[PDB]
Design a protein around this ligand. Structure first.
Ligand SMILES: Nc1nc(NCCCN2CCN(c3ccccc3)CC2)nc2nc(-c3ccco3)nn12
Ligand SMILES: CC(C)CCC[C@@H](C)[C@H]1CC[C@H]2[C@@H]3CC=C4C[C@@H](O)CC[C@]4(C)[C@H]3CC[C@]12C
Ligand SMILES: CC(C)CCC[C@@H](C)[C@H]1CC[C@H]2[C@@H]3CC=C4C[C@@H](O)CC[C@]4(C)[C@H]3CC[C@]12C
Ligand SMILES: CC(C)CCC[C@@H](C)[C@H]1CC[C@H]2[C@@H]3CC=C4C[C@@H](O)CC[C@]4(C)[C@H]3CC[C@]12C
Ligand SMILES: CC(C)CCC[C@@H](C)[C@H]1CC[C@H]2[C@@H]3CC=C4C[C@@H](O)CC[C@]4(C)[C@H]3CC[C@]12C
Ligand SMILES: CCCCCCCC/C=C/CCCCCCCC(=O)OC[C@@H](O)CO
Ligand SMILES: CCCCCCCC/C=C\CCCCCCCC(=O)OC[C@@H](O)CO
Ligand SMILES: CCCCCCCC/C=C\CCCCCCCC(=O)OC[C@@H](O)CO
Ligand SMILES: CCCCCCCC/C=C\CCCCCCCC(=O)OC[C@@H](O)CO
Ligand SMILES: CCCCCCCC/C=C\CCCCCCCC(=O)OC[C@@H](O)CO
Ligand SMILES: CCCCCCCC/C=C\CCCCCCCC(=O)OC[C@@H](O)CO
Ligand SMILES: CCCCCCCC/C=C\CCCCCCCC(=O)OC[C@@H](O)CO
Ligand SMILES: CCCCCCCC/C=C\CCCCCCCC(=O)OC[C@@H](O)CO
Ligand SMILES: CCCCCCCC/C=C\CCCCCCCC(=O)O
Ligand SMILES: CCCCCCCC/C=C\CCCCCCCC(=O)O
Ligand SMILES: CCCCCCCC/C=C\CCCCCCCC(=O)O
Ligand SMILES: CCCCCCCC/C=C\CCCCCCCC(=O)O
Ligand SMILES: CCCCCCCC/C=C\CCCCCCCC(=O)O
Ligand SMILES: CCCCCCCC/C=C\CCCCCCCC(=O)O
Ligand SMILES: CCCCCCCC/C=C\CCCCCCCC(=O)O
Ligand SMILES: CCCCCCCC/C=C\CCCCCCCC(=O)O
Ligand SMILES: CCCCCCCC/C=C\CCCCCCCC(=O)O
Ligand SMILES: CCCCCCCC/C=C\CCCCCCCC(=O)O
Ligand SMILES: CCCCCCCC/C=C\CCCCCCCC(=O)O
Ligand SMILES: CCCCCCCC/C=C\CCCCCCCC(=O)O
Ligand SMILES: CCCCCCCC/C=C\CCCCCCCC(=O)O
Ligand code: NA
Length: 388
């Protein structure tokens, strides 16, 4: 039985190193959004709320974690607060991650009404509501779902605790059924599975919209060939009607002028076709190639470029949500083994604190993901660092 202070010193030192990195990195995130108006959108307001939660992990949750690892004597309800405040920050992170995913689905599924529906004022109201709900969820043990009514009196007496005090240990005061059923299953696992469903819908919507862009482009060029090798006016008419319906379908200033020319030129050739002038209709339809090269192809390439940037931005946000799951799941899974298998030996002490440190490391990783995957953040980070 090596002296407890030795293994404790390693744990505390690692925790302090994580606290400094979580504060520095996420302060840089908040500083960047404050300074750059190009980073000031609804999506990044939830990013800032997520960074504030990670800042508080280093300022409060990690000092709280170091304190409870000592098992110090404390009034049980004060011990409860130290033990549960990290659950508030974790729940806030979940709400921010879910809001980011929903925000990106709205942008890709209904971009015409995104700016009218998703505003900064409504976003700030959602952020406040989610923080209130995070305190209620994370501090639910302080409402009565705790073990303070059944204190470990032998442990308190051996540590010399005073009357009404307990040895402040996490699994002594926080019920494991709350941690597994309420916190993990209901409040962590279900929202993460919802985020998964949202991102699946995002990428499915992106793939469908890109295919529709390419299908209208192919339909335009195929029907042009049909008109060129038609032998009667009725065949030219058939191809032109399909081109006109697709042109209006692809339309839903230089963008508008290009489609205004295209639809008008289609109506010109259609009128010649209805008069039975095949050669004259085919020559009029040949003018469409000038409009296609000068206007339509540029919109196709820009619409494609915008969708691919939305896919890339959604992938970056999904990586953030996935890294949250990877960092928090081991600790939750260990609680499941403790709760569901009382015949299994408890996970060893070194593995408990490895899982605790790993969960805390999640508060360090998000600034690196933004810096490596988002150019606007990376450039703003460099300006802040260089100029300071
Ligand atoms: N489960 C849990 N524990 C702690 N801290 C106490 C660890 C040391 N114990 C010391 C006494 N035991 C022990 C006894 C013999 C051998 C090994 C261990 C249990 C662990 N902190 C937490 N945080 C979240 C958590 C937060 C969010 C999701 O899960 N679970 N958790
Ligand atoms: C704005 C920020 C900096 C304020 C932070 C306040 C924190 C540090 C305070 C608020 C409530 C406090 C707890 C209230 C009750 C108890 C029970 C006592 O038997 C031991 C200390 C303990 C567990 C306190 C520890 C410190 C504590 C968590
Ligand atoms: C900005 C918002 C979250 C305000 C923060 C205030 C919180 C952190 C403070 C304010 C008053 C504090 C409480 C005051 C008294 C007690 C009684 C003690 O037996 C257990 C701790 C407990 C329950 C404290 C826990 C922390 C506490 C709830
Ligand atoms: C989230 C991804 C990376 C999966 C992580 C799997 C981890 C959390 C799993 C894999 C194997 C598991 C261990 C396998 C066996 C035992 C022995 C039992 O007496 C207590 C739990 C304990 C010690 C498990 C704890 C959790 C564990 C370490
Ligand atoms: C997000 C995805 C990975 C789903 C989460 C999977 C979790 C809920 C699964 C993975 C492995 C599972 C554990 C595997 C083995 C045992 C031992 C058994 O005696 C009691 C249940 C218990 C402890 C399981 C509980 C649930 C469990 C922890
Ligand atoms: C123990 C005490 C600890 C205190 C806990 C504090 C928890 C609450 C913290 C919340 C941080 C929220 C910051 C999030 C800020 C988001 C940006 C915003 O909302 O403004 C943009 C829009 O307004 C545009 O119109
Ligand atoms: C406790 C953790 C500390 C957290 C502090 C949050 C810092 C918020 C600073 C970054 C938010 C800036 C912002 O969103 O304003 C833009 C709007 O004005 C657009 O009109
Ligand atoms: C702003 C930051 C200012 C915060 C100042 C506090 C920083 C953390 C220090 C907490 C230190 C609190 C623990 C000291 C203690 O309990 O010793 C006495 C007992 O051992 C006797 O039973
Ligand atoms: C700055 C460093 C402040 C950390 C101070 C925390 C000291 C507590 C300790 O190391 O003993 C408790 C463990 O042995 C549990 O058994
Ligand atoms: C602000 C950041 C400060 C974090 C400090 C975490 C809270 C530190 C908790 C103090 C521990 C304590 O009160 O020990 C004395 C008891 O044993 C009396 O019986
Ligand atoms: C959702 C809205 C969130 C706002 C919630 C407000 C409810 C405030 C209730 C706060 C009441 C505090 C409970 C308490 O201190 O009693 C100790 C118990 O452990 C004894 O069993
Ligand atoms: C996603 C959510 C999955 C929730 C499914 C929860 C199903 C849990 C059922 C259960 O554990 O009962 C067996 C008891 O005997 C254990 O002691
Ligand atoms: C993820 C979605 C699915 C979640 C299902 C998780 C179920 C976890 C399985 C809990 C059931 C159990 O372990 O019962 C133990 C008793 O039979 C006595 O050993
Ligand atoms: C980093 C600074 C070093 C912190 C040392 C932790 C040990 C404290 C202790 O066990 O009492
Ligand atoms: C994780 C840590 C990365 C921190 C990069 C250092 C920049 C600090 C600048 C600041 O905090 O304002
Ligand atoms: C510990 C908590 C520290 C939080 C760090 C967040 C800093 C980022 C934005 C806060 C607003 C800016 C405050 C001073 C502005 C000065 C200026 O605009 O020139
Ligand atoms: C930027 C503000 C950050 C706050 C710095 C606080 C750092 C100190 C970390 C942990 C303090 C833990 C004290 C341990 C409890 C006493 C031990 C015992 O009573 O047995
Ligand atoms: C604010 C910056 C933090 C200031 C001082 C850190 C010193 C904390 C001392 C821990 C006390 C542990 C103990 O006495 O058991
Ligand atoms: C449930 C907890 C209630 C919290 C009150 C917070 C007030 C926020 C209202 C803003 C609504 C909005 O504009 O979206
Ligand atoms: C459950 C009662 C305790 C509520 C305190 C925490 C709520 C903090 C309020 C707003 C968070 C920031 C608002 C965003 C602008
Ligand atoms: C949402 C707010 C959640 C919790 C409020 C905390 C109140 C705890 C007071 C404990 C005092 C007692 O034991 O009666
Ligand atoms: C963990 C317990 C959860 C508590 C369940 C019910 C509490 C929250 C209820 C409603 C939140 C909705 C807030 C709506 C505010 C109105 C905004 C407006 O005026 O436009
Ligand atoms: C519970 C596990 C799922 C957690 C992952 C959440 C979001 C990332 C989505 C992956 C994209 C498809
Ligand atoms: C490297 C990171 C840790 C890797 C795997 C964790 C699993 C180790 C399980 C140890 C057995 C626990 C026991 O004996 O009760
Ligand atoms: C991520 C960083 C990886 C480094 C791993 C070291 C961190 C934690 C494992 C140390 C085990 C300490 C035993 C706990 C002793 C105690 O707190 O009483
Ligand atoms: C203890 C330190 C916690 C470590 C956290 C990992 C966060 C990011 C690590 C990789 C940084 C990028 C790189 O290596 O190039
Ligand atoms: Na977090």
């Amino acid at each position: 039985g090596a002296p407890p202070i030795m293994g404790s010193s390693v744990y505390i030192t690692v925790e302090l190193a994580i606290a400094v990195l979580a504060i520095l990195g996420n302060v840089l995130v908040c500083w960047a959004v404050w300074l750059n108006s190009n980073l000031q959108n609804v999506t990044n307001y939830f990013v800032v709320s997520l960074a504030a939660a990670d800042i508080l992990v280093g300022v409060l949750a990690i000092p709280f974690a170091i304190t409870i690892s000592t098992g110090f004597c404390a009034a049980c309800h004060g011990c409860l607060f130290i033990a549960c405040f990290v659950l508030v920050l974790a729940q806030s992170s979940i709400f921010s991650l879910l809001a980011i995913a929903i925000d990106r689905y709205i942008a890709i599924a209904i971009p015409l009404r995104y700016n009218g529906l998703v505003t900064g004022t409504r976003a700030a109201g959602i952020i406040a509501i989610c923080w209130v709900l995070s305190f209620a969820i994370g501090l639910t043990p302080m409402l009565g779902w705790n073990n303070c009514g059944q204190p470990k009196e032998g442990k308190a007496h051996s540590q010399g605790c005073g009357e009404g005090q307990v040895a402040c240990l996490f699994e002594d005061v926080v019920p494991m059924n709350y941690m597994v059923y309420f916190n993990f299953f209901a409040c962590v696992l279900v929202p993460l599975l919802l985020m998964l469903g949202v991102y699946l819908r995002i990428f499915a919507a992106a793939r469908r919209q890109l295919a529709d862009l390419e299908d209208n482009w192919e339909t335009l060029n195929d029907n042009l060939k049909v008109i060129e090798k038609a032998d009667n006016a009725a065949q030219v008419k058939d191809a032109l009607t399909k081109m006109r319906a697709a042109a209006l379908d692809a339309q839903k200033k230089d963008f508008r002028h290009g489609f205004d020319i295209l639809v008008g030129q289609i109506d010109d050739a259609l009128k010649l076709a209805n008069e039975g002038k095949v050669k004259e209709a085919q020559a009029a339809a040949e003018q469409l190639k000038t409009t296609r090269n000068a206007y339509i192809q540029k919109y196709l390439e820009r619409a494609r470029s915008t969708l691919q940037k939305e896919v890339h931005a959604a992938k970056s946000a999904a990586i953030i949500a996935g890294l949250f799951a990877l960092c928090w799941l081991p600790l939750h899974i260990i609680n499941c083994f403790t709760f569901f298998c009382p015949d299994c030996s408890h996970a060893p002490l070194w593995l408990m604190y490895l899982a605790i440190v790993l969960a805390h490391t999640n508060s360090v990783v998000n600034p690196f993901i933004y810096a490596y995957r988002i150019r606007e953040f990376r450039q703003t980070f460099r300006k802040i660092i260089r100029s300071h």
